[PDB]
Design a protein around this ligand. Structure first.
Ligand code: MG
Lengths: 1113, 223, 98, 229
């Protein structure tokens, strides 16, 4: 019983939702393809790109070493082992590199072993050194060339945008006042004239044939001293390329920055030729400038962009066009392209190591596989994946998370001029790029906008760059519409008519403005290419999960757009009543669940592995159980199917993490009345009905993972044993079987989680002691306890234990580190005071009190409510539509239904009524049957609701009811005392999640203990644990008041000042008197610390001459 | 007047509208509620306390051949409502399951002074390797109690379960005014004392009043 | 509502902080070594409720402020001999134990 | 060591009104589920006795004024409502008559000094009349529990009556908070406290038990049943 609301839908949010990657990587990691085709980008390019390495003597002797087809191959280990043995899920990659001679000699070193190129899981992420990580797609200034106003004082500047931040230099032509036209490549400012001279141009042939209509020239001529002769030119320019290199015309160096596709090349143009052409005086080719022709160079883009400059420095072709952040200028390098460039580096180093081994060694013995030392492609490559501001863990709390995190787009990339946390130009970018296919209500706080998420139907097709959404054009296809697309307007969703949408006023967007109604009304190619396949594409895949976004105010609407990431799978995943089709797909691209393949059949046994689909072949399917989430989410799978066939409108074949039967199910939906409850729901706190705990609802299960390494340090070998000295206390093996704790064991705080003794030789057990020791059989001792034990965090039930030991197979551990015990501990948490509940409309809040069914607000027939969300502020203050969920609530509770009211299309107030209107003729249709009907309490109200001109007067009480049900809802008694709540109190089933933020993990308390031995102030330790921070802000706090003493105490008897510390604990343990300080250590020490530098810090008293007695002990 | 008319459309364990009658204008709740309040709280009942399963060292497990998942079980078993037919005591049902079947709470070994109010009650869909031998407590009790009332017993894998005692499952009450007496002003009660596990409304209602009385009593001698 | 006569005290001495000192030194004088420094002892004794029953409370300042608001005591530049101000304590049962 | 299964009922007794009552440790949930119904019945169902209709020679309707009387009708009317009579214990439900003299303060005693019905509140302005102090009242008094406005109807002296309202109920205010304490370790155990205000004859505490009785007296109604399968 599912009700849906809506209109059209020509496509689907598209497969899969993890295509940004997945289908990306592969096509960059070609490999899978027969080693013939596949021509560029990805690994191959990097290869071809690194030009066959030569060496001294250009075409004189032996050694050429040309590269060929590479070979990703026989994958060392397997996912799972990798994480178990902390290993990057890599794979070998070698490529035969036949070197040459100049006395004929063809040698092909088969394969030639090489780097380990990390593979990507079916998922769309990586396993690196055990943990799971994700490569987040960055965006930057699209390659090209496009000036921009000189931010200084009015005077447009010219920028040249090389392809990727590692395939060309950022060149800015800057026309100034004192210096004029400058060519500043990387770290070098110089007369722009000079390079031109080299390129041929020159006084007259140059300006006065270029820059006339707009002065800006004499300054370019003056240094004509440079414009007096090329060749000699380079040399002076070369001389202007630090350090003191050898002035000797070489052409090389410039053998780049234009010459050949080496460190400059937008490749076969595409976004360089295909762009500068339609920006400059047309005409161009593969790169900038062109040499190696037969002599002098032949520029292609160095004056025309200078021309087009001046032009916009005083002429008509303005186009001040700054980065213009137009997604027709904002590129996005998908993982594959981030991992590719890195190869475009591993090699950059190999080529060196190769050219070098070339020489030295015997030209007859100098063969490859002996010339190639596979260190570059690794290192620098395995360097990236786990050490990049762009490679990150993985939000794995609830599945939406993971999936979501891949759709995310970082701009905090580490590229060139790539916005630093506050890089040069920040609180400008942030803002909504008028390009809608990279959501507007997602981001967080502080990183406000430098990290956005990309829209649903966004991208998918011939991709050279930038998102590009899908946009209908009258039936048929939907065209992967570019981002620099005008295509004669666009007509927004709605106002249709079979196939001719009869609106004759159709609303549309064109270039920007919502521009009223172009009205082409051609019914033909959708008024050009107008029309958007559904709205969805306007927003983030994980926002579209909001039943009433419409009403929901952007800002707050984002506070739910995120928050709901921080779900936290439970046991009763519950899909939401009002959900939005998406709920059903998000959890099917996450692969967090187990699908099917062909037709039906089953066989199975059910439990640990939905057994073989049984379809023709035979394949068993194991079910991950009580795993561990990067966030400690405990994502397990559930077996759904007994003994049947394929699918029943969906082959869920057993759910996943936080998904009710196939539908994404973050939290639980429950019934709630709105209304201020004696303060317990003050500001934002939600009061809660004990029931939710009694019915094991919000209960979430988390499994931790404690660790211990067995060192070797010079005192004796560190060993993992169950013979912890003295720890006899019938504890040891009262648990800890032959060393480490046992499964199913139950762990409180303090118990030995994984014991291990240690030698340490503090002092020598001198006589007497050794004697007395012998005497009273006081067996001498040499080993310390140094066990593991569980921290002040309660603990839980020992779920499992892994153990890695040096010499083991695929492992490998930190030098010195031998063996490494690991132990997982579960936990099931229910719900307590503290913790957040936050719904889909950013109505976030933390539980305050939890009433017993007894109290609470009894509905009329006795059913208690669930949460007591306060109406104050929250709604008004936040203006949202978390009400149009609570209304289609009972109108779905009683009518017993789950609904689909998608974003910007459905579930309308009248329908919400129609429905609600109904589902009453039963709610109440019953009462007038069970044998009851409206009592003194309900009348007492109704006859006052109309006073509130809230219900139609004249009508019968019964009549006033239904009337007062569509809107709010029944009198709603206060099961606490007994009377009614004067004034109805809208009641309903919302849907509250339980954000990975339970109180437990927070809240600690100190008093003493873990005192430090480096800074001498409470931090780190063993037994107790604790320690609280007292920042500066609080210093002023006390300064501002007058609690001088109260302040001192925080820089005396409570931290560094030992005398004091002890004084304190001695003072209390006794009683009567208090912590008595005097001269804080902080002072006695500052003196005898400045002295050490040759200063005589004197402490003169009241009269200057009463010179202190200080430190006189 | 001088007294009402305590009607009582009863039932068969659960459902128990118990109508007083010409209660003077007001007391419609002075009585109506507390009972209802009390009837949802302080009242003796039956509830599981701990379960032990064949080869299950502790919760967060997974019994082979069984479709389910050990927690579900305990979550399901959390319901199973027993009856005791006896004065003071706790006890331990016991059930072993075979190959392909559907161990619904019913298959819970018949035994002594005990009834299984809620037979059926799909306890576990085991199959192919129907192995399930279990041992669940079931203590007398009152109210709600979780991790505290330790389910020791089979000192080992008790995986103690939650205590959900209160045999009452819902309680409301109307004040419908359509009676005689002396002038159309007074009210007319009718508390329902809805569903239950073992005990019957009348009993809940009855047991209820007692308490309210004993407390009412406490108002004795003051200092 | 707050401190019994907190306002009343703020009247007695001058500088708001001055008092904080007096009560402080006083508390740090009263149930600090002796207890036989009281002035409230009679029918006006700060007694604490606690299951079993009543009985004074171990909160120095508590008695302090309310002993001050009493009448005795004095403050400023008197008893010049701080030395003889704490030694005079020897003149009448002091010390404790450890 | 200080509560067990027997709360400690503690009163305050002031003398005729305000008398704080406070039983102590009680399982969480009875402060309400108990301390409330009393406060309810307390405000209602309680035998009481107060004026209810007044004949005072001349001008019927309560709206008007009389010469040689500093006040007006209604002021006496209400000034009357603050009268406290005590009908010994027979069955009583009589009338009363005041003897107004010249220029003096007509107390709430200048009535027919009839025994068997004493006046707790001797004073009470009632009304002022100077010089030609006329004034003759045959102020009645009835017997009731709840509250009754212009609904009963002042039959008595057929003509002329200005019936006042039935403010008959000994208690005049009933409040109650339920702060929680834990003299019994467990930091959250209900703790009533009552503040019954009464001056309309019957003492406070007396009002309480009476009601407490009125409630059990009532509770017994749920005894012998008459079902239906
Ligand atoms: Mg906050």
């Amino acid at each position: 019983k599912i009700k849906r609301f809506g209109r059209i839908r020509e496509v689907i949010p598209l497969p899969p939702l993890t295509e940004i990657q997945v289908e990306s990587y592969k096509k960059a990691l070609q490999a899978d393809v027969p080693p013939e085709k596949r021509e560029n980008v990805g690994i191959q390019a990097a290869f071809k790109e690194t030009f066959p390495i030569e060496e001294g003597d250009k075409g004189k002797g032996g050694l050429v070493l040309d590269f060929l087809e590479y070979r990703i191959g026989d994958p060392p280990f397997s996912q799972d082992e990798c994480r178990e043995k902390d290993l990057t899920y890599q794979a070998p990659l070698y490529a035969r590199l036949q070197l040459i001679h100049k006395d004929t000699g063809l040698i092909k070193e088969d394969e030639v072993f090489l780097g380990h190129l990390p593979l990507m899981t079916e998922d769309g992420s990586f396993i690196i050194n055990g943990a799971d990580r994700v490569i987040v797609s960055q965006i930057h200034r699209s390659p090209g060339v496009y000036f921009t106003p000189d931010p200084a004082r009015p005077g447009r500047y010219i920028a040249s945008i090389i392809p990727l931040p590692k395939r060309g230099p950022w060149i800015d032509l800057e026309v100034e006042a004192s210096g004029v036209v400058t060519m500043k490549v990387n770290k070098r400012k110089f007369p722009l004239v000079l390079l031109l001279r080299v390129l041929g141009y020159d006084q007259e042939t140059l300006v006065r044939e270029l820059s006339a209509y707009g002065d800006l020239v004499q300054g370019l001529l003056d240094e004509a001293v440079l414009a007096m002769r090329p060749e000699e030119a380079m040399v002076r320019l070369f001389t202007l390329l630090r350090p003191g290199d050898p002035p000797k015309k070489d052409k090389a160096l410039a053998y780049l920055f234009g010459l050949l596709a080496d460190p400059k090349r937008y490749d076969l143009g595409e976004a360089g030729r295909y762009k500068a052409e339609e920006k400059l005086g047309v005409g161009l080719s593969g790169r900038t400038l062109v040499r190696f022709e037969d002599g002098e160079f032949k520029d292609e883009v160095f004056l025309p962009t200078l021309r087009y400059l001046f032009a916009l420095t005083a002429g008509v072709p303005g186009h001040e066009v700054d980065d213009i952040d137009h997604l027709g200028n904002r590129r996005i390098r998908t993982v594959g392209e981030l991992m590719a460039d890195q190869f475009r580096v591993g090699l950059a180093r190999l080529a060196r190591g190769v050219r070098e081994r070339m020489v030295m060694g015997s030209p007859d013995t100098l063969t490859p596989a002996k010339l190639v030392n596979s260190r570059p492609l690794e290192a620098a490559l395995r360097e990236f994946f786990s050490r990049s501001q762009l490679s990150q863990f993985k939000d794995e709390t609830n599945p939406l998370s993971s999936l979501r995190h891949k759709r995310r787009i970082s701009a905090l990339g580490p590229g060139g001029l790539t916005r630093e946390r506050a890089g040069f130009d920040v609180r400008d970018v942030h803002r909504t790029h008028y390009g809608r296919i990279c959501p507007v209500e997602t981001p967080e706080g502080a990183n406000i906008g430098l990290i956005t998420s990309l829209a649903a139907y966004a991208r998918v097709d011939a991709l050279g760059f930038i998102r590009t959404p899908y946009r209908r054009v009258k039936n048929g296809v939907v065209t992967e519409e570019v981002v620099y697309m005008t295509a004669s307007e666009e007509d927004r969703y709605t106002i249709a008519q079979a196939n001719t949408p009869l609106e004759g006023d159709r609303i549309a967007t064109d270039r920007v403005v919502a521009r009223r109604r172009g009205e082409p009304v051609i019914v033909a190619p959708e008024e050009v290419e107008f029309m958007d396949v559904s709205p969805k594409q306007v927003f983030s895949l994980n926002t579209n999960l909001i039943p009433f976004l419409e009403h929901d105010d952007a800002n707050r609407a984002l506070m739910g757009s995120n928050m709901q990431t921080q779900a936290v799978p439970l046991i009763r995943a519950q899909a939401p009543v009002v959900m939005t089709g998406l709920e059903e797909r998000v959890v099917r691209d996450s692969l967090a669940a187990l699908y099917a393949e062909e037709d039906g059949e089953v066989v199975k046994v059910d439990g640990t592995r939905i057994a073989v689909r049984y379809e023709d072949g035979r394949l068993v399917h194991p079910l991950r159980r009580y795993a561990r989430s990067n966030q400690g989410t405990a994502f397990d799978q559930r077996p759904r199917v007994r003994v049947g066939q394929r699918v029943k409108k969906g082959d869920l074949l057993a759910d996943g993490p936080a998904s009710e039967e196939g539908f994404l199910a973050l939290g639980q939906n429950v019934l709630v009345a709105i209304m201020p409850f004696d303060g317990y729901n003050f500001e934002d706190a939600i009061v809660i009905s004990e029931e939710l705990l009694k019915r094991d609802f919000y209960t979430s299960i988390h499994i931790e993972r404690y660790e211990i390494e067995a060192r070797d340090t010079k005192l004796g070998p560190e060993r993992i044993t169950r013979d912890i000295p003295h720890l006899s206390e019938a504890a040891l093996r009262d648990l800890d079987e032959e060393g480490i704790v046992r499964i199913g064991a139950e762990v409180k705080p303090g118990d030995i989680l994984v014991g291990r003794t240690s030698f340490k030789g503090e002092q020598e057990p001198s006589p007497e002691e050794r004697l007395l020791r012998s005497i009273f059989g006081e067996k001498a001792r040499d080993v310390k306890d140094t066990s593991l034990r569980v921290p002040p965090g309660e603990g839980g039930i020992v779920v499992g234990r892994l153990r890695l030991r040096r010499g083991d197979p695929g492992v490998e551990l930190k030098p010195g580190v031998r063996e490494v015990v690991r132990v997982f501990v579960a936990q099931k948490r229910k719900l307590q005071v503290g913790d957040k509940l936050a719904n889909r409309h950013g109505n976030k809040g933390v539980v305050a009190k939890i009433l017993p069914v007894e109290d609470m607000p009894h509905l009329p027939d006795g059913t208690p409510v669930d949460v007591i969300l306060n109406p104050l502020g929250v709604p008004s203050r936040m203006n949202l539509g978390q009400i149009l969920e609570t209304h289609l609530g009972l109108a779905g509770y009683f009518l017993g239904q789950r609904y689909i009211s998608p974003v910007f299309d459905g579930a309308t107030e009248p329908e919400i009524k129609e429905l609600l209107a109904e589902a009453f003729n039963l709610y109440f249709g019953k009462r007038q049957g069970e044998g009851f009907g409206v009592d003194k309490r309900e009348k007492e109200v109704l006859a006052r609701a109309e006073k509130l001109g809230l219900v139609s007067p004249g009508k019968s009480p019964e009549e006033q009811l239904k009337e007062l049900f569509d809107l709010g809802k029944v009198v709603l008694y206060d099961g606490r005392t007994g009377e009614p709540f004067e004034g109805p109190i809208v009641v309903g089933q919302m849907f509250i999640m339980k954000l990975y933020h339970m109180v437990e993990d927070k809240m600690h308390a100190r008093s003493t203990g873990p005192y430090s031995l480096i800074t001498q102030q409470p931090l780190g330790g063993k037994a107790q644990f604790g320690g609280q921070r007292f920042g500066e802000m609080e210093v002023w706090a006390l300064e501002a008041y007058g609690a001088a003493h109260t302040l001192q105490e925080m820089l005396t008897i409570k931290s560094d000042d030992i005398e004091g510390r002890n004084a304190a604990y001695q003072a209390i343990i006794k009683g009567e008197d208090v912590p008595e300080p005097s001269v804080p250590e902080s002072f006695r020490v500052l003196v005898k610390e400045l002295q050490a530098l040759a200063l005589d810090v004197q402490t003169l008293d009241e009269k200057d001459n009463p010179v202190d007695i200080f430190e006189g002990l | 007047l001088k007294a009402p008319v305590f009607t009582a459309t009863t039932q068969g364990d659960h459902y128990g509208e118990f109508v007083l009658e010409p209660l003077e204008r007001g007391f419609g709740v002075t009585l109506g509620n507390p009972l209802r309040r009390i009837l949802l709280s302080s009242i003796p009942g039956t509830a599981v306390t701990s379960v032990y399963i064949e080869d299950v060292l502790h919760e967060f497990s997974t019994i082979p051949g069984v479709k389910e998942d050990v927690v579900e079980i305990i979550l399901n078993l959390k319901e199973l409502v027993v009856r005791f037919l006896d004065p003071r005591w706790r006890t331990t049902l016991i059930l072993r399951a075979e190959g392909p079947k559907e161990v619904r709470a019913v298959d819970f070994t018949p035994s002594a002074d005990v009834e299984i109010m809620n037979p059926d009650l799909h306890i576990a869909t085991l199959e192919e390797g129907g192995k399930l031998y279990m041992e669940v407590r079931v203590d007398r009790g009152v109210g709600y109690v979780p991790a505290e009332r330790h389910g020791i017993k089979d000192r080992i894998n008790a995986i103690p379960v939650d205590a959900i005692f209160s045999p009452v499952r819902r309680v409301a009450f109307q004040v419908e005014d359509t009676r005689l007496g002396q002038r159309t002003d007074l009210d007319k009660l009718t508390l329902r004392i809805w569903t239950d596990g073992s005990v019957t409304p009348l009993e809940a209602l009855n047991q209820a009043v007692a308490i309210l009385k004993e407390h009412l009593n406490y108002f004795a001698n003051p200092e | 509502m707050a401190e019994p006569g907190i306002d009343k005290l703020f009247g007695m001495v001058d500088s708001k902080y001055r008092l904080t000192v007096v009560v402080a030194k006083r508390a740090q004088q009263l149930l600090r070594h002796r207890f036989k420094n009281t002035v409230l002892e009679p029918e006006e004794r700060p007694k604490m409720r606690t299951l079993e029953g009543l009985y004074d409370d171990p909160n120095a300042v508590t008695w302090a402020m309310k002993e001050l608001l009493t009448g005795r005591l004095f403050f400023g530049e008197n008893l010049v001999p701080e030395d003889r101000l704490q030694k005079e304590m020897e003149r009448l049962y002091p010390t404790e134990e450890e």
